[PDB]
């Protein structure tokens, strides 16, 4: 369950290719845009996970 600064087309394509290139067994790549310099986003991220 990886986070990123912003979710746009380029990162979407990069992460899609990353999963489809490296995935195995029952792998699942969750992904959400969050700010690591914001305590509110950290709290939202932990309560979302």
């Amino acid at each position: 369950i990886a986070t990123t600064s912003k979710l746009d087309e380029e990162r979407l394509a990069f992460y899609r290719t990353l999963y489809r290139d490296h995935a195995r067994y029952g792998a699942a790549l969750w992904l959400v845009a969050a700010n690591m310099a914001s305590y509110s986003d950290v709290d939202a991220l932990v309560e979302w996970i």
Binding site: L7, R16, Y19, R20, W30, L31, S38, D41
Partner: protein, 48 residues
């Protein structure tokens, strides 16, 4: 101008103590409905 003055001082000491780019560098972006899942391996396996 009654609350704009103390708010102006708030902005001033935020700029002096932290910086003028603190709201940008700190603003939240998280939204639970903008998450994406990528757990479709079987279709990728067939295409591969």
């Amino acid at each position: 101008a009654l609350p704009a003055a103390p708010d102006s001082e708030l902005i001033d000491l935020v700029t002096a103590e932290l910086g003028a780019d603190w709201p940008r560098l700190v603003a939240p972006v998280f939204d639970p409905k903008k998450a994406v899942v990528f757990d479709d391996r079987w279709a990728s396996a067939r295409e591969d």
